[PDB]
Structure formats: structure tokens, C-alpha cells
Amino acid sequence: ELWAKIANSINDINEQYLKVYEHAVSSYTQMYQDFSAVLSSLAGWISPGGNDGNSVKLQVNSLKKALEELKEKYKDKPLYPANNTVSQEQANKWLTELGGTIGKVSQKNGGYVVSINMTPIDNMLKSLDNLGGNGEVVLDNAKYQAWNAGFSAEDETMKNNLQTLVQKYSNANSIFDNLVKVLSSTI
Amino acid sequence: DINEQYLKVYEHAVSSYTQMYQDFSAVLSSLAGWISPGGNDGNSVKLQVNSLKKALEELKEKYKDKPLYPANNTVSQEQANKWLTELGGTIGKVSQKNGGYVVSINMTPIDNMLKSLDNLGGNGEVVLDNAKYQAWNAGFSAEDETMKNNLQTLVQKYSNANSIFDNLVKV
């Protein structure tokens, strides 16, 4: 009777709050899986240097291509919203809720979306440019170890992002179920 | 809507992925034992690629016919794709089974682990210097994180569904 009002109000919170979180986790996870595939390929792009014997040979070209394709695939795959677009202020509120580490407000058609923040990949591509080129590059130990400390930084940033996004979605689940109770208690 | 039968689907999916990850963790329990001081000359480690590949291939083989949905039976492509979307489309993969389709456990992380092990040539013990070892570990641990986060998300989805149910079928 007047619980149909509660049913509707709960459903709408699910639609405007929880479903947004579910979709942001799903989009980011898909990007991270693809990034993990790039990481899984890296060991095969690395081999021992030569004249002898403290150096590493890196197929910087194969790595650049893999990172570039990752970026292109996730250009028009927002964290929010799943369909169509929203208003610039609407995107900024969700940016805040999700975090500026995870997302980036970006323009699309007549509106705005919160895209995946690809800055860690952007950072990787820059270093690779500094090398200087084009896959088969030979780096001495200190140089490789320096390039790597930066690249690992990026790979552990994206890992932390995913983990925190999931924790923060785990929270929104608890917050919703809580509300769901507080509104059933009206009966 | 959420049904008493929408939950049955989520409970079985949760249970299947959970079990798969538990078995993967049994592999993690053996890992350090497959790693050892190598060379013997310079800064390197030896990895029993063969033993680890065997454990991963076996985990794949075990879950090959243990779909997330449906437990028993098969559906249309369109219906399977629907549930794949529903589950947070990263945990599962639509695959052909007998006459129809099912939402299988996504084993891509394991396949990637396996491909990387192949990039380490020797179908025997390989010697990895720091650069190569760090690269291998970064990839392997990233694939592991993918599965871990997939499990947590699905468990949260199940928890929610179950909460909505308990309350909207008590009132």
C-alpha cells in the first residue's frame, strides 16, 4: 500500500547510487585485466644484454604498442555514466565520490562523462620515449633499474586504484543495505 | 525485480569462483618452494617453470566444466550474455556447451600466466636475473589481483541481493 513508496524509493537509490558504483568497478576492472595482460607480456620483451655481462635488452617498441592500444581501447569507455552523458557538474560530483586518482571528467558529445584516468599509462609512454626508441634498446643496469622504478610505480598505482575502488564499492553496498533497513522500518 | 531464483544463480556463481580462487591460493602456497638461488654465478633465481605450469593447467582443467551459470543446463547466447553483464562482465566468459551456451569462469588471468611462463622458454627450470624476475612477478601478481578483486566484487553483489531479499520479503 504505502510500502510501494518505499519500494520505489529504494529502487531509485539503487539506480542512482549503487548501480553507478557497480558500473565504475566493472569498467575499471576490465581496463586493469587488459593492463595485467600487458604486464604478463613484459618478461618476454626482456632479455639479457651482451658484452658482458651486466645489461638488459628491452623491446621498447612492442611495449609501447601494447600500452598505446590499451589507451585507445578505453578512450570511449567511461567509468560513468554507462549510457549517454551527464552535465559537467553531475560528472564532477561523481568524480569526487570516486576520486581524482581513478577518474577524469571529460567532454563527450553534448555532455560530460567521468572517463578512466589514464595518466599512469601516459607516464609510462613518456619514459619509453626518453630511451630512446624503438625496441631493441640495450640498457646498462643502473639505467634499466631507474626506468623500472618509475614503471613499477605506475603499475602499483593502478593496482591500488582498483583495490580502493572495490573497497569503496564494498562500502556503498553496506550503506545501501543500511538505508534499505531504515526505510523498511517505516512500516 | 530480484527473485528467490535470481539468488540461486548468484549463490552458485559465488561458490564456484570462490572454490576456484581457493585452489589458486593452494598454488600460491607452493610458489616460494619453486623459487631458489640460481646462477650459480651472478644475481639470479631459478624458477621451476614446469611444476608451476602443471599446477595452473590442472586448475584450468578442473573448472573447465564448472560454469558460473547455469549450474545444470544451458541457455541461448543472448540469455548467457545477459547474465554475463549482470555478474560484472569480467568474472565470466560466454562459452559454447552442448547445444547452447553458459557463462564459464573467466580463466583469462590463468591463460596469461601460462603464456608468460612460455615466454620463459625452457619447459624445465629457467634462470631469471633481477630484470626478468621482477617483470615476471609484476605480471603474475597483477593477474592474481584481477581474480581477487573479481571475487570481492561478486561477493558484494551477492550480499546486496540477499539483503534486498530478506527485507522486501519480510515486509
From Swiss-Prot, chain A:
It comes from the Bacteria. Changing residue 12 to N: In plasmid pINV_F6_M1382. Changing residue 88 to K: In plasmid pINV_F6_M1382. The N-terminal domain is an intra-molecular chaperone that prevents premature oligomerization of the residues on the coiled-coil region that are involved in interactions with the needle and/or itself. The residues in the C-terminal domain probably form oligomeric structures at the tip of the needle that are responsible for the regulation of secretion of other effectors. Deletion of amino acids 1-20 abolishes invasion activity, affects contact-mediated hemolysis activity and IpaD secretion. Deletion of amino acids 41-80 and 81-120 restores invasion activity to a higher level than wild-type and reduces contact-mediated hemolysis activity. Deletion beyond amino acid 120 reduces invasion activity and abolishes contact-mediated hemolysis activity. Required for bacterial invasion of host cells. Controls IpaB and IpaC secretion, and the efficiency with which they are physically inserted into target cell membranes. These proteins are exported via T3SS to form a pore in the host membrane that allows the translocation of the other effectors into the host cytoplasm. Along with IpaB, is essential for both blocking secretion through the Mxi/Spa translocon in the absence of a secretion-inducing signal, and for controlling the level of secretion in the presence of this signal. This is Invasin IpaD. It comes from Shigella flexneri. The gene is ipaD. The chain holds residues 133 to 319 of 332 of the full protein.
